[PDB]
Design an enzyme around this catalytic site. Structure first.
Site, short mmCIF file in Angstrom:
data_model
loop_
_atom_site.label_atom_id
_atom_site.label_comp_id
_atom_site.label_asym_id
_atom_site.label_seq_id
_atom_site.Cartn_x
_atom_site.Cartn_y
_atom_site.Cartn_z
N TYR A 1 0.64 -1.21 0.29
CA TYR A 1 0.09 -0.09 -0.31
C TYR A 1 0.77 1.35 -0.02
O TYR A 1 0.31 2.39 -0.47
CB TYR A 1 -0.71 0.07 1.49
CG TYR A 1 -1.10 1.57 1.47
CD1 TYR A 1 -2.95 1.23 0.68
CD2 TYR A 1 -1.37 1.60 1.72
CE1 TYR A 1 -3.37 2.33 0.53
CE2 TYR A 1 -1.89 3.40 3.02
CZ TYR A 1 -2.86 3.62 1.34
OH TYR A 1 -4.00 4.63 1.51
N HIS A 2 2.03 1.17 1.13
CA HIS A 2 2.90 2.70 0.84
C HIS A 2 3.07 2.80 -0.25
O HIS A 2 3.75 3.97 -0.31
CB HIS A 2 3.60 2.56 2.24
CG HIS A 2 2.36 2.34 3.16
ND1 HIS A 2 2.08 3.19 3.37
CD2 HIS A 2 3.07 1.45 4.00
CE1 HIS A 2 1.74 2.51 4.61
NE2 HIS A 2 2.08 1.51 5.30
#
Ligand code: CL
Ligand code: CL
Ligand code: CL
Ligand code: CL
EC number: 3.1.-.-
Length: 99
Positions: free
Chosen positions: A91-92
Site C-alpha cells: 500500500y505504501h
C-alpha cells in the site's frame, strides 16, 4: 472467478499450490482471500469488514484493494462476476494520488 494474474507468486499459489512467491506465514490468509475473490459474484461479496475493501484512483481507477495484513494488499479489477489482474502489493508504494 479469478481469470488472470499480474503477480506470479499469487498465480503459482492459486493455480498450483506453490508457495514460494508469497510470505510463508501469509499463505493461509492469502489463500482465504483468493478463494473469497474467486467465489464472489459481485464486489459486495468481498465487502467483509476485515478486508477494508477500497477502490483505487487515477491510473488505478477500476482497481479494488483488500487487506491481507498490515500494509499488504491484493488488488484486482472486478467486472461481470469475475476478477482480473490479481496483484500483491505494498500500500505504501501507491502514491497519494492513487488511493
Ligand atoms: Cl494469468
Ligand atoms: Cl514467483
Ligand atoms: Cl505461473
Ligand atoms: Cl459487482
Amino acid at each position: 472467478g479469478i481469470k488472470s494474474f499480474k503477480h506470479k507468486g499469487l498465480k503459482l499459489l492459486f493455480e498450483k499450490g506453490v508457495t514460494s512467491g508469497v510470505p510463508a506465514q501469509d499463505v493461509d490468509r492469502i489463500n482465504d482471500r483468493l478463494q473469497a475473490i474467486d467465489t464472489a459474484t459481485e464486489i459486495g461479496e468481498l465487502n467483509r469488514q476485515i478486508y477494508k475493501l477500497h477502490p483505487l484512483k487515477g491510473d488505478r481507477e477500476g482497481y479494488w484493494s483488500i487487506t491481507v495484513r498490515a500494509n499488504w494488499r491484493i488488488t484486482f479489477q472486478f467486472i461481470n462476476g469475475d476478477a482480473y489482474i490479481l496483484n500483491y502489493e505494498d500500500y505504501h508504494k501507491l502514491g497519494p494520488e492513487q488511493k
